[PDB]
Design a protein around this ligand. Structure first.
Ligand SMILES: Cc1cc2nc3c(=O)[nH]c(=O)nc-3n(C[C@H](O)[C@H](O)[C@H](O)COP(=O)(O)OP(=O)(O)OC[C@H]3O[C@@H](n4cnc5c(N)ncnc54)[C@H](O)[C@@H]3O)c2cc1C
Ligand SMILES: Cc1cc2nc3c(=O)[nH]c(=O)nc-3n(C[C@H](O)[C@H](O)[C@H](O)COP(=O)(O)OP(=O)(O)OC[C@H]3O[C@@H](n4cnc5c(N)ncnc54)[C@H](O)[C@@H]3O)c2cc1C
Ligand SMILES: [Cl-]
Lengths: 122, 126
C-alpha cells in the first residue's frame, strides 16, 4: 500500500520520541551520533557537549537526522536532510530554552532542506 | 563510559529496531531495519528490488541501535560488511532467528553485517 508520509505527519511523529541520530559524512566515511532532541517549528533542536567530535563534524555542515519507532504491527521512520546551525540569536536562544529536553553548553538546530517519512508493515 | 564488546553485543539484543548507514561520495543514506544478533553478527532480512539491497549488500556499512530511559541511555555502532546468506549452515541459523514477520512475500533475502569493529557508549544527560 501507500507508505510515504507527509510533512505535517513526519514532524509530529518525531515528537513522540526523544532519541535520534545525527549522521555526518566526509567523502566516503560517515559517522553517526545519537542525540536527545526536541522538535521546534520544523527544526530539530539538541544540545551538544563542548570539545566533542559531534560539534566539529556537524556544525555548519550538511547532516542527516533520523528517528523512528515501531510496534509488533507497524513501524515508522523520519529522515531530515539539513544543516546543523549553532543557536546564536537572542530569539533563537530564548526559544531553545523553552525546550523540555532530558536533564555554558551550546544549543544546535538542524534546519531542514527536506524531511521524509516511511511506514513499514510487519 | 566506554563499553566493552560483550556489553555491546548483548545490549543490541535488548532492542529489535536498528539502522543501516551507507555512504557513497560525501552523501549518506540510512535504512531502519528489524534485526537480531547471531554469534556477533547483525542479521536482517531485505526486501527485493529495494534500494537497501543495492546500497548495503557487499559494501561497507554502519549499523547502529540505541535505547534510553529518563536518566541514562546507551548506543552501539557496528562497522562491518553486509554479506548475503549463501550457505546451508548459515541459512539454517538465520531461519531460527526471532525476527518480526512481514507480509505475504515468502521471498527471503537474508543479510548479515559481519563486524570489523563494534563500539558502545553510555550517556547520562547531566
Ligand atoms: C543514548 C545517547 C544519547 C546521547 N545524547 C547526546 C546529546 O544529546 N548530545 C551530545 O552532544 N551527545 C550525545 N551523545 C553522545 C554522542 O552520540 C557521541 O557519543 C559523541 O558526540 C562522541 O564524541 P567524542 O568526541 O567522544 O567521540 P570520539 O571519542 O572522538 O569517537 C571515537 C569513536 O568512538 C565511537 N563512538 C563515539 N560515540 C559513540 C556512540 N555514542 N556509540 C557508539 N560508538 C561511539 C565511534 O566509532 C568513534 O569513531 C549521546 C550518546 C548516547 C549513547
Ligand atoms: C520501522 C522500519 C523498519 C524497516 N525494516 C526493514 C527491514 O527489516 N528490511 C528492509 O529491507 N527494509 C526495512 N525497512 C524499509 C527500508 O528503510 C527501505 O529499504 C527504505 O525505505 C528504502 O527503500 P526504497 O528503495 O523503496 O527507497 P527509495 O525509493 O530508494 O528512497 C527514496 C528516498 O525516500 C526517502 N526514504 C527512504 N526510506 C526512508 C525511510 N525509511 N524513512 C524516511 N525516508 C525514507 C529517502 O529520502 C530516499 O532518498 C523498514 C522501514 C521502517 C520505517
Ligand atoms: Cl549577526
Amino acid at each position: 500500500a501507500v507508505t510515504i508520509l507527509s510533512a505535517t505527519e513526519c514532524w509530529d511523529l518525531l515528537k513522540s520520541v526523544a532519541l535520534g541520530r545525527i549522521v555526518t559524512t566526509v567523502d566516503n566515511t560517515s559517522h553517526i551520533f545519537p542525540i536527545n532532541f526536541v522538535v521546534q517549528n520544523r527544526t530539530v533542536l539538541f544540545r551538544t557537549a563542548e570539545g566533542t567530535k559531534l560539534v566539529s563534524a556537524a556544525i555548519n555542515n550538511n547532516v542527516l537526522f533520523e528517528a523512528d519507532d515501531h510496534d509488533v504491527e507497524q513501524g515508522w521512520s523520519v529522515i531530515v536532510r539539513g544543516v546543523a546551525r549553532t543557536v546564536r540569536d537572542e530569539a533563537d536562544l530564548a526559544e531553545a530554552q523553552r525546550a523540555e529536553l532530558l536533564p555554558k553548553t551550546h544549543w544546535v538546530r538542524v534546519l531542514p532542506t527536506q524531511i521524509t517519512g516511511r511506514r513499514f508493515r510487519f
